[PDB]
Each structure stands twice: as C-alpha cells, then as structure tokens.
Amino acid sequence: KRPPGFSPF
C-alpha cells in the first residue's frame, strides 16, 4: 500500500 522506507505511525 505504501512505498519502501515508510513505517506505521
């Protein structure tokens, strides 16, 4: 769903 490197917050 989201791009690489991105994390939940």
Q: How far does CA 5 lie from the centroid of its chain?
A: 6
Experimental technique used? Answer: NMR
Q: How far does CA 2 lie from the centroid of its chain?
A: 5
| Side-chain-side CA neighbours of residue 8 (13 Å) | 1
3-class SS at 8? Answer: coil
Give the start-end residues of each E strand in 1-9.
Answer: none
User: How far is 2 from 9, CA to CA, in rounded Å?
Assistant: 13
Residue bearing tokens 């917050």 = 9
3-class SS at 7? Answer: coil
3-class SS at 6? Answer: coil
User: How far is 4 from 6, CA to CA, in rounded Å?
Assistant: 6
The one-letter amino acid code at 6 reads F
